[PDB]
Design a protein around this motif. Structure first.
Motif, PDB file in Angstrom:
ATOM      1  N   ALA A 156      64.069  29.350 -10.174  1.00  0.00           N
ATOM      2  CA  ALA A 156      63.941  28.374  -9.204  1.00  0.00           C
ATOM      3  C   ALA A 156      64.785  27.184  -9.188  1.00  0.00           C
ATOM      4  N   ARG A 157      65.664  26.978  -8.502  1.00  0.00           N
ATOM      5  CA  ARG A 157      66.691  25.763  -8.395  1.00  0.00           C
ATOM      6  C   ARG A 157      66.017  24.582  -8.320  1.00  0.00           C
ATOM      7  N   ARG A 158      64.856  24.384  -7.779  1.00  0.00           N
ATOM      8  CA  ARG A 158      64.029  23.230  -7.609  1.00  0.00           C
ATOM      9  C   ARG A 158      62.701  23.523  -7.514  1.00  0.00           C
ATOM     10  N   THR A 159      61.875  22.448  -7.741  1.00  0.00           N
ATOM     11  CA  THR A 159      60.190  22.787  -7.594  1.00  0.00           C
ATOM     12  C   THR A 159      59.692  21.429  -6.594  1.00  0.00           C
ATOM     13  N   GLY A 160      58.273  21.606  -6.583  1.00  0.00           N
ATOM     14  CA  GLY A 160      57.726  20.511  -5.941  1.00  0.00           C
ATOM     15  C   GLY A 160      57.685  20.443  -4.342  1.00  0.00           C
ATOM     16  N   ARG A 161      57.358  19.338  -3.802  1.00  0.00           N
ATOM     17  CA  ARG A 161      57.390  19.080  -2.242  1.00  0.00           C
ATOM     18  C   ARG A 161      58.731  19.027  -1.596  1.00  0.00           C
ATOM     19  N   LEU A 162      59.160  19.564  -0.681  1.00  0.00           N
ATOM     20  CA  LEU A 162      60.377  19.553  -0.033  1.00  0.00           C
ATOM     21  C   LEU A 162      60.449  18.348   0.858  1.00  0.00           C
ATOM     22  N   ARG A 163      61.308  17.337   0.768  1.00  0.00           N
ATOM     23  CA  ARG A 163      61.351  16.312   1.699  1.00  0.00           C
ATOM     24  C   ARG A 163      62.908  15.619   1.636  1.00  0.00           C
ATOM     25  N   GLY A 164      63.423  15.500   2.812  1.00  0.00           N
ATOM     26  CA  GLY A 164      64.552  15.159   3.262  1.00  0.00           C
ATOM     27  C   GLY A 164      65.315  16.362   3.530  1.00  0.00           C
ATOM     28  N   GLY A 165      66.128  16.673   2.921  1.00  0.00           N
ATOM     29  CA  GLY A 165      66.821  17.860   3.293  1.00  0.00           C
ATOM     30  C   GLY A 165      66.557  18.968   2.209  1.00  0.00           C
ATOM     31  N   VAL A 166      66.817  20.366   2.796  1.00  0.00           N
ATOM     32  CA  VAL A 166      66.404  21.468   2.159  1.00  0.00           C
ATOM     33  C   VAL A 166      67.771  22.160   1.646  1.00  0.00           C
TER      34      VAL A 166
ATOM     35  N   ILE B   9      48.586  27.305 -16.867  1.00  0.00           N
ATOM     36  CA  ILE B   9      49.913  28.054 -17.461  1.00  0.00           C
ATOM     37  C   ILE B   9      50.148  27.022 -18.552  1.00  0.00           C
ATOM     38  N   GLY B  10      50.173  27.402 -19.867  1.00  0.00           N
ATOM     39  CA  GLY B  10      50.682  26.564 -20.870  1.00  0.00           C
ATOM     40  C   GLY B  10      52.121  26.212 -20.986  1.00  0.00           C
ATOM     41  N   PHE B  11      53.036  26.974 -20.129  1.00  0.00           N
ATOM     42  CA  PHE B  11      54.430  26.954 -20.279  1.00  0.00           C
ATOM     43  C   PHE B  11      55.110  26.639 -18.828  1.00  0.00           C
ATOM     44  N   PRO B  12      56.254  26.100 -18.708  1.00  0.00           N
ATOM     45  CA  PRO B  12      56.866  26.138 -17.547  1.00  0.00           C
ATOM     46  C   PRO B  12      56.831  27.202 -16.533  1.00  0.00           C
ATOM     47  N   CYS B  13      56.186  27.144 -15.115  1.00  0.00           N
ATOM     48  CA  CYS B  13      56.286  28.284 -14.700  1.00  0.00           C
ATOM     49  C   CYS B  13      57.666  28.777 -14.203  1.00  0.00           C
ATOM     50  N   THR B  14      58.677  28.006 -14.025  1.00  0.00           N
ATOM     51  CA  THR B  14      60.063  28.254 -13.494  1.00  0.00           C
ATOM     52  C   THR B  14      60.755  29.289 -14.736  1.00  0.00           C
ATOM     53  N   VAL B  15      60.688  30.583 -14.534  1.00  0.00           N
ATOM     54  CA  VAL B  15      61.160  31.387 -15.488  1.00  0.00           C
ATOM     55  C   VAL B  15      62.661  31.974 -15.261  1.00  0.00           C
ATOM     56  N   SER B  16      63.405  32.243 -16.050  1.00  0.00           N
ATOM     57  CA  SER B  16      64.820  32.331 -15.744  1.00  0.00           C
ATOM     58  C   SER B  16      64.888  33.750 -14.812  1.00  0.00           C
ATOM     59  N   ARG B  17      66.374  33.937 -14.584  1.00  0.00           N
ATOM     60  CA  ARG B  17      66.791  34.807 -13.831  1.00  0.00           C
ATOM     61  C   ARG B  17      67.000  36.236 -14.664  1.00  0.00           C
ATOM     62  N   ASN B  18      67.475  36.139 -15.886  1.00  0.00           N
ATOM     63  CA  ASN B  18      67.540  37.233 -16.893  1.00  0.00           C
ATOM     64  C   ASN B  18      66.255  37.514 -17.515  1.00  0.00           C
ATOM     65  N   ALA B  19      65.150  37.247 -17.316  1.00  0.00           N
ATOM     66  CA  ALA B  19      63.651  37.232 -17.618  1.00  0.00           C
ATOM     67  C   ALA B  19      63.410  38.944 -17.540  1.00  0.00           C
ATOM     68  N   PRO B  20      62.994  39.378 -18.347  1.00  0.00           N
ATOM     69  CA  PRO B  20      62.919  40.993 -18.635  1.00  0.00           C
ATOM     70  C   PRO B  20      61.991  40.973 -17.370  1.00  0.00           C
ATOM     71  N   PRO B  21      61.873  42.362 -17.043  1.00  0.00           N
ATOM     72  CA  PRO B  21      60.653  42.730 -16.019  1.00  0.00           C
ATOM     73  C   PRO B  21      59.392  42.855 -16.991  1.00  0.00           C
ATOM     74  N   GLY B  22      58.490  41.876 -16.741  1.00  0.00           N
ATOM     75  CA  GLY B  22      57.077  41.873 -17.459  1.00  0.00           C
ATOM     76  C   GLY B  22      57.041  40.486 -17.912  1.00  0.00           C
ATOM     77  N   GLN B  23      58.131  39.480 -17.939  1.00  0.00           N
ATOM     78  CA  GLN B  23      57.678  38.100 -18.024  1.00  0.00           C
ATOM     79  C   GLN B  23      58.499  37.376 -16.941  1.00  0.00           C
ATOM     80  N   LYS B  24      58.941  37.840 -15.843  1.00  0.00           N
ATOM     81  CA  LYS B  24      59.495  37.471 -14.604  1.00  0.00           C
ATOM     82  C   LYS B  24      58.560  37.376 -13.479  1.00  0.00           C
ATOM     83  N   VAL B  25      57.371  36.569 -13.870  1.00  0.00           N
ATOM     84  CA  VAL B  25      56.255  35.897 -13.383  1.00  0.00           C
ATOM     85  C   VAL B  25      56.405  34.388 -13.081  1.00  0.00           C
TER      86      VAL B  25
END
Ligand code: ZN
Lengths: 106, 50, 249, 114
Positions: free
Chosen positions: C239-249, C218-234
Motif C-alpha cells: 500500500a502506498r497510503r492508507t486511511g480515508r481518501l480526501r482531496g486528491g487521489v 492485528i498486532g502488526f502493521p497491515c501494510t505488508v511489503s511487495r516482496n512478501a512471500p506467498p503466505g504472509q502477503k495478507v
RNA sequence: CAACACCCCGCCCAGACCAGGCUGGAUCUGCGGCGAGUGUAAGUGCAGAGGUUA
RNA sequence: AAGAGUUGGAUUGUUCACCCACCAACAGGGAACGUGAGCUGGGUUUAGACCGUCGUGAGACAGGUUGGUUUUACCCUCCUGCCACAGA
RNA sequence: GGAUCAACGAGAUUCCUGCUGUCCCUAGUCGCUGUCUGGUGAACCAACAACCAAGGGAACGGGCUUGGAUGUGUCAGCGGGGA
RNA sequence: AAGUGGCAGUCACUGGUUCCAAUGAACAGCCUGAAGGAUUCCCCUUGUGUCCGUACUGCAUCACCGCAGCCGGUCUCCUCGACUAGACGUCGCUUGUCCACGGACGAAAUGCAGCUAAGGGAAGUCGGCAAACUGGCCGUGCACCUUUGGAAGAUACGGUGGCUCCAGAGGCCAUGGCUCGUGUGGAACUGUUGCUGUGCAGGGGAAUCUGACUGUUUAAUUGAAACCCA
RNA sequence: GGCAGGAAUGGCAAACAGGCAAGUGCGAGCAAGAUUCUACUGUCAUGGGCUGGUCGGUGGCGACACCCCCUCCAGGCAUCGAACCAGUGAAUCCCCUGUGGAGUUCUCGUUUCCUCCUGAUGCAGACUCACGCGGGCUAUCGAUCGGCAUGACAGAUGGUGGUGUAUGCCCUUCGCUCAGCAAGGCGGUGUGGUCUCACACCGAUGG
RNA sequence: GAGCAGAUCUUGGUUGUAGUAGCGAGUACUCCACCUGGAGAGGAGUGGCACCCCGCUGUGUGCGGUUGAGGACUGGAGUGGAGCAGGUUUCCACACCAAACAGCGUUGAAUGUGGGUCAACCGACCGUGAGCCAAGUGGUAAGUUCACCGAACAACCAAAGCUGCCU
RNA sequence: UGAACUAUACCGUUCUACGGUGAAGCCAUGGGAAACUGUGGUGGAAGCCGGUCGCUGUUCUGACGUGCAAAUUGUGUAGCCUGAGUGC
RNA sequence: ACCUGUUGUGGUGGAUGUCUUGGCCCAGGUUCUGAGGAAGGACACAGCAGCCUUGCGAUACGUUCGGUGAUACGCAGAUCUUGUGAUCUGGACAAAGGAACAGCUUCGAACGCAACUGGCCAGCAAGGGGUCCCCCCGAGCUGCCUGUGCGCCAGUGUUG
C-alpha cells in the motif's frame, strides 16, 4: 452423530474387485487398485512390508509354467549331483555315429 | 438388488456352490480326514466383500 | 502452520470458475482482409444474458471470410444495440454506435468500448457493465493513440487496435444496494467459490497471520511489503497510503 | 377397486423425473395401473432471432415419428414452408425485392454520374 | 402308631416375600332386604319454538 | 445445669455481612472446614466468546462477563425393618 | 469503531400481572418397575478379611495394644464406611 | 347421433402472471427449407432384433450399516372415509398384524411416567427451574415507540351447543321442471350457563445489556454477545 | 490408381438427465418369474431377393390443403429455473335412480354394505366458431361516433388493424362415438358327472 | 534359551459375585378345535382287584403352531404395495428343532435336501455432462496415483484412411 | 492408503401440507381551481409470521448412564420450515 | 440344614512326560521365468467333492509315450493278470534317430478399441452350417516403442 447413527449412512463402495489381484481394493472413482495399482504395468510392492510381498510371491499360485521349468531344473540338478554332465555327441564322435547310422540304414 | 454384473453374478454363484457341507464319505478316508467344513459361510454371519 | 485461503485458491481445485453454463469468450471478430481494407457487415442476431457477467452479450453473425458460411461471433453488447442491427466492422466503417473500426478512424473525442490492447487482439479492454474508454489523442509519427480507460488511467495503444463505438450495456447495476446476503450468494454462485469471506482476525494463528489473540486484532502493521512471500502477503499489499481518501487521489 | 386404488412404477425408474410421468388408468380387469406418458415436442419454430414462434401446418412428432411420417405432416406448400411463417417469408420477399431495386438504382445512377 | 405342629385349600384386624391373626358342620357362591352414591332409566302416553299438509 | 429449644424473610453463589419482622431466645461451635455412588451445580476451575489493562506477538490477568457432559452398589459391614435354625 | 436505535432473538439480567405442590406440607390415585415367580441369566470388583472405642503408629485401623460387645444363617432396602 | 351427475386434493396439459446484480446443460438422433447436381423402367433360420440384469429383501423392530435378530441411521414412487383450514390431531373400510420373555399377588418402600389437591400464592430456589394459566374461530377493538414497513394475535371485551325457522348465491332444460351455498347473517325455543365440551390448541405486559435482521456454528458437555451478511 | 470434395487424434463416463417401440386377462396354467411365460390384441427399428418427351402434380384470395437420391448452407425439434393464479381431463372419492348379492330387523329404516368395469392400439368418426377445454394465423371490414371499445380471477389488446362476420385455416391437451369389447372382468344363480373340470342363465354398458 | 510369587507381567483355564442385576419404548390378548411321545397334565397316586373292573384322591391360570369365534392395533407422510444402494439365495416346497441359534421352539431368515429368476417393447449397453484415460508432446536422477484433455478454450502438432464418379 | 462418515466446489436430479398477513400493479369512487388526495375492492410480494413433513438440538441441566444406543431417549419442551432451504 | 476341614470318588480343565511327514541353523550346487505370453488373479472341471492340491483347462484330479509291473480304495461300477498290462512314477517327461516334441478357458507386461460392460451387437476373413444373394456360427489378422527391409509418399532442402 459420529458413531452408531452415522454408520447407517455407510452404503456405497470406494473399492471393488480388481481384475489383476482379485482383491476388493480397486478404487472406483479414481480407477486405481489400492493394492497392485492395476492401471500401471508394474505391480505395486514396497520393501517396507515383507508380509505384503509374501502374500503375492511366486509360489502362492498355480505356477502353471514355472513349476514345470523348476521340475526340469530339479531333474538336471539331481543328475549333476550324481555325476557331472557328459555330452552324448561331441566333435570326436559325430562322424563315427553318423557313418555307423549310414551303413546300418543302407 | 436386481442389478448385477456378469462377473459379480458368477462370483456369487461360485460362493453359493462353495456354501456346502462336506460329503459324508470323506471322514472315512483312511488317513484321518476332515470331520466338518471349516470354510462355510452364512449370509447372516459373515458378508462377502465383492 | 497451515496455508492461507488466498494461497489455496490459486491451487484451483474447487475455486475454478462456475462457467459451465456460460456463452464462451466475448471478443471482436478476428482481423481479416475485409476488416483491414474496407468494412464487413454483421447482423446482430441475438442479445443474451451470460452467467456470471453483468453485461449482456450479442451473437452477431458475419459471413465467412473465404467459405460459403455464416460465422456467428459473440461480443459484449453495446448499449443501444438491438437485434437485427447491422453493425459494421473494418477500416472504412462509419462512426456509428456498435461499429467496430480501428482506433485511427476515430476523432479525438470518441467514446469506445470492447477496446483492443494489441493489434489483431480481440477486445481485452473496457468490457464490464457500463464501461467505456475515451480516445484522447492520436500520434501519426508512431501510429499510436492515447486513450482514457474506465479506471481513469491513460493507456497508449497502437492506432490499429479496433474498438466498438459506444457504452457497454447493462449499466447502473452497482447503483442498487444488494439488500440481502442471499443476493450476493446467488451473485457469486455463478462466478466462483469466493463468498462468504471469513476475516483473518476471526481465525486461529495456524490459519492466518492475523488469527488468535485474546482480542480480535492485528498486532502488526497491515501494510505488508511487495516482496512478501506467498503466505504472509495478507492485508494491504504494498500500500502506498492508507486511511480515508480526501482531496486528491 | 380390486387390489386397492394405489399404483406403482412399472419401469426401471423410481424418480419423479420429466421422463416418468405416469397416468393412473383403470384397466378392464377393474384394476388400477399406470400408463406412462410421452414427451410432446414443441414442433418446428421460427428462428430465435425472428421471434421464436411455432409454425402452423405441421404436427409435433418426436424424432422417429418424424422420420417415418408422411410429408404433409412435416412440410407446408409455400416457400420456406415448415421453416418460416408466411409473414416472415413475405417480409423476406419484400426486403429482397426492394433492396435489389435500390441496388439497380444506385449502380445505374453511378454509371450515369460516370 | 398316635398326639400335636406345619403345608395346600378358605377369610383378613396383618403383610414386599415371609411372618401375624382367624377358620374346618367353619365357609363359599348367589338371591333378598337395609343403608348409601347418582340424580329421574328404557319403553310408552303432557306441553313444544315453529315449519308442513287438508 | 448441655434436658428441650434457638425461627420467617429481602440482596448476595456466597461462609460471612446487612437490614425487615416474630420470639422465652432467635448462643457459639464440631463431626475428612460432617454430609455430591444423598441432591444441586449458583461459584470457583478446561475447551467457545466479549470487554479492560498488559505483551510486537501467540497469549496473561485473586480484573469483570456469558455459556458450558457431575457416572456405578446387586459385594461386605453399619443402620432399618423381616425370618428361620439354634443344629457346633 | 463511538452514541442513539424500530424490528427480530431457545442470548444475559430486573420488575408487574395472571397462574400454579416451587413452597408452608404433604396427601391421594394410576401405568410400568421393583416386590413373588416359570424359562434364561451377565458384569463391576476381589491381598485376606469384613462389630466398635481409645491409644500408639507413615500423624484418620478391619487386623496391632488395652478395653467393650458379639449364636449361626436370611429377605427387602440402604447410601455412614470399606480414606 | 358422437363434452358435460358432483365437486375436494393429487397428477397431466393449457393460458398466463411474478422472481433473479441467479436467466436455469450437452451430445447423439431427427426434421424442414434454400441453392445446385443427377435421373436405365410379395417372399426370405415364422428375414434380423445378438449380449447381460431379472428370485426375495430393501425407512428393514429379523434380510443393509451400527460386533447383534441393536428404540439408532438409511433413496424414491402411490396414497381411502369422517371431524377439521388441514398430508396437524383423533377414530374407521381396504391391506397387514397381535410380535416384542411371560404368570400370579391390588401390587410394600423407592423409582420412572400420568394426574389431581383445600387455604395461601415464589414465602421454595443461584434463579418462577418444573408445572400450571392462555389457547381455534367470529364480532368490536387496540397503547407507547417507530426505520412509517411495523409494534399487533398488542393489551382487551363479547359470543360459540341442540333444534325449528327467516333471509341470502348460482347452474341446466325449457319464468315452470330439475339441480341447488356442509359458505354466511338474523330470530324463536331449549339446557342444572354451556358448547374450539374430545385429540389438538399463544399466558401477557414493562425495562437494562447485547447482536441490526434472516443465515451459520464446536457430530459426542459450550447455539452464544461467537462466525457470516448487507 | 486418377479426378472432386474432406482444419481441428481415439475413447471412457449417468441403471435419475438425452435416448425406437406393449397393453389386457395381473391369466393357459406357477409352490415360488413375469410389461420376460401364456392367450389374445398390437408397436418399433432394420437387411436382402423378386416384380424430337422428365425441375412430381393440383386445389385455395389467404392462413393452407390434397393425390402420385447426392452435395452444401440456413434454421428448428431434442431442450431444459422456480413459484403463483385460472381452466380442462384422468383416476380416486361422493351423490341420485335402478339391478344383483349380503348385513340388520326387539322397534325404525323404499334402509346399510359390496358390485354395475374397459387397457394399449386404429391412415376410424363428429366438433375444434374449442357453440366442453385456447392459443396462433387468414380474408373482409377500418374503430375514439365526440361517453373508445374487446376480453380476463389477474394479466392483456387494438390504424404495427380493435370489434363484428366467415368454406374461415392450423396445432395441441383432452373429452365423446366406434373397433379392441364382452367372448373378458365384476356380483351372483344353477346343471353334470364329479376328481386327480366343462357347460347354462341373470345382473346400469344409467345421470 | 538352565530355578519365579509378584513385573496394572504374557498365553490358557477357572472361581466368588450369583441363580444375583436383569431380560419393563412400539396399547392385547381370550375361547373352542385340530396337529403331539406327552400338553384337559400323576409313575408303577390309593383301597378293594386278582390285568379288567369299581371306588376314592391329586393336577402348576399351563409349551409350540394353525383354522374358526371374539377383542384390539396399523390408520394411506402405514406395520400396505413397488423398486435404489447394500444384502446375495435370505425366495419356494418338503423333511426337520432334541445338535446348536432365534435373550419358547409340532414355528423361523435355523438345519438338510431339492427347486426357482425366460425380454426386439423393462433397464445397463448408445453417446454426452461434470470429470478421466490413452495419444501427441514435455518434465524428472527415474517409475509414478508426473503435466496438459484445450470443437468456448492448447500445443513444440504431416492424427482429414472417409465419400462421388471413373476402374 | 482414505472424501462410503464428514467439509466444500461442479454435473444430473428430487422435495417443499394448511393457514395468517397483505407489497407493487389494477378497478370503481368521494374531494380539490389545480398539484394532489380519501374510501371499498382486486392482486398475491417477502432470505415475512403460525404451523405439517422434514431438518436442527434450547430446556428439563428429565430418562438412561453394566443403556435401545462407544450420544440414544420423552404420549415432553424447543429453533427453522420459499429459502444463504433440502437430499440423492 | 449351612459352613470349615481331611480322605475316597466323580466332573471341569488341559499342565506334565514321551514322540514328530515341522521349523531353525550351517555347508555345497543351481538360479533353469516372459509377447512362442511369465508371476499372479478369476471362472470352470470328479458317479458320490465343499475345502486343499507346485491338481488340472471344454482333451479340464486328467491325454500320448517311457520306467515299473497287480493294484486303487471312503463307498460302490466295468476295465485289468505269464499281460497293449491294474497301479504308481517320469517337465508332454527316455529314445542319439535333425526320429519324436499333444493340448493349455479367462484377466494379467496383456496387445483391435474399451471394460464396474464378457460392450463396440468392431473392421477384415479361411472355413462350417441354413437356404447367387442373404442368414447364423466363425479359426485367424489388426497393441505400442525401437531396429532392419519392402511399398507408397512429402518438402519455395541440394541439385539436374
Ligand atoms: Zn489390483
Amino acid at each position: 452423530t459420529k458413531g452408531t447413527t452415522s454408520f447407517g449412512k455407510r452404503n456405497g463402495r470406494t473399492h471393488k474387485l480388481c481384475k489383476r489381484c482379485g482383491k476388493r481394493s480397486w478404487a472406483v472413482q479414481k480407477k486405481r487398485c489400492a493394492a497392485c495399482g492395476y492401471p500401471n504395468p508394474k505391480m505395486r510392492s514396497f520393501n517396507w512390508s515383507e508380509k505384503a510381498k509374501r502374500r503375492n510371491t511366486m509360489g502362492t499360485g498355480r505356477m502353471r509354467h514355472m513349476k514345470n521349468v523348476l521340475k526340469k531344473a530339479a531333474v538336471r540338478q539331481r543328475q549333476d549331483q550324481v555325476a557331472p554332465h557328459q555330452k552324448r555327441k561331441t566333435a570326436e564322435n559325430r562322424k563315427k555315429f553318423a557313418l555307423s547310422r549310414k551303413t546300418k540304414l543302407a | 438388488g436386481a442389478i448385477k454384473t456378469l462377473k459379480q453374478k458368477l462370483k456369487y454363484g461360485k460362493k453359493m456352490k462353495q456354501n456346502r457341507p462336506i460329503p459324508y464319505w470323506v471322514r472315512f478316508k483312511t488317513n484321518s480326514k476332515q470331520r466338518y467344513n471349516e470354510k462355510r459361510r452364512h449370509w447372516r454371519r459373515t458378508k462377502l466383500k465383492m | 502452520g497451515k496455508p492461507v485461503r488466498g494461497q489455496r485458491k490459486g491451487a484451483g481445485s474447487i475455486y475454478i470458475t462456475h462457467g459451465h453454463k456460460r456463452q464462451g469468450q466475448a471478443r471482436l471478430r478476428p482481423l481479416d482482409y475485409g476488416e483491414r481494407k474496407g468494412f464487413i457487415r454483421g447482423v446482430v442476431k441475438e442479445i443474451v444474458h451470460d452467467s456470471g457477467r453483468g453485461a449482456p452479450l450479442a451473437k452477431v453473425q458475419f459471413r465467412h471470410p473465404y467459405k460459403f458460411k455464416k460465422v456467428t461471433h459473440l461480443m459484449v453488447a453495446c448499449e443501444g444495440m438491438y437485434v437485427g442491427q447491422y453493425i459494421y466492422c473494418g477500416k472504412k466503417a462509419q462512426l456509428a454506435i456498435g461499429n467496430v473500426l480501428p482506433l485511427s478512424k476515430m476523432p479525438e473525442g470518441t467514446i469506445v468500448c470492447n477496446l483492443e490492447a494489441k493489434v489483431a487482439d480481440r477486445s481485452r479492454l473496457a468490457k464490464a457493465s457500463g464501461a467505456y474508454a475515451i480516445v484522447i489523442s492520436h500520434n501519426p509519427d508512431t501510429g499510436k493513440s492515447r486513450v482514457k480507460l474506465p479506471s481513469g488511467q491513460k493507456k497508449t495503444v497502437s492506432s490499429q487496435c479496433r474498438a466498438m463505438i459506444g457504452l457497454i450495456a447493462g449499466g447502473g447495476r452497482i447503483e442498487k444496494p444488494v439488500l440481502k446476503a442471499g443476493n450476493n450468494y446467488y451473485r457469486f454462485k455463478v462466478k466462483r467459490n469466493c463468498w462468504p469471506r471469513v476475516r483473518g482476525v476471526a481465525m486461529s494463528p495456524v490459519d492466518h497471520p492475523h488469527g488468535g489473540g485474546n482480542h480480535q486484532h492485528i498486532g502488526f502493521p497491515c501494510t505488508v511489503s511487495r516482496n512478501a512471500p506467498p503466505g504472509q502477503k495478507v492485508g494491504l499489499i504494498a500500500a502506498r497510503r492508507t486511511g480515508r481518501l480526501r482531496g486528491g487521489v | 377397486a380390486i387390489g386397492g386404488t394405489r399404483v406403482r412404477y412399472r419401469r426401471h425408474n423410481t424418480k419423479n423425473t420429466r421422463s416418468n410421468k405416469i397416468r393412473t388408468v383403470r384397466t378392464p380387469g377393474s384394476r388400477i395401473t399406470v400408463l406412462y406418458r410421452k414427451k410432446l415436442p414443441k414442433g418446428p419454430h421460427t428462428p430465435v432471432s425472428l421471434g421464436h414462434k411455432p409454425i402452423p401446418g405441421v404436427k409435433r412428432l418426436r424424432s422417429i415419428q418424424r422420420k417415418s411420417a408422411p410429408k404433409r405432416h412435416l412440410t407446408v406448400s409455400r416457400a420456406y414452408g415448415g421453416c418460416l411463417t408466411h409473414d416472415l417469408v413475405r417480409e423476406r420477399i419484400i426486403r429482397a425485392f426492394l433492396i435489389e431495386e435500390q441496388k439497380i438504382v444506385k449502380r445505374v445512377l453511378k454509371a450515369q454520374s460516370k
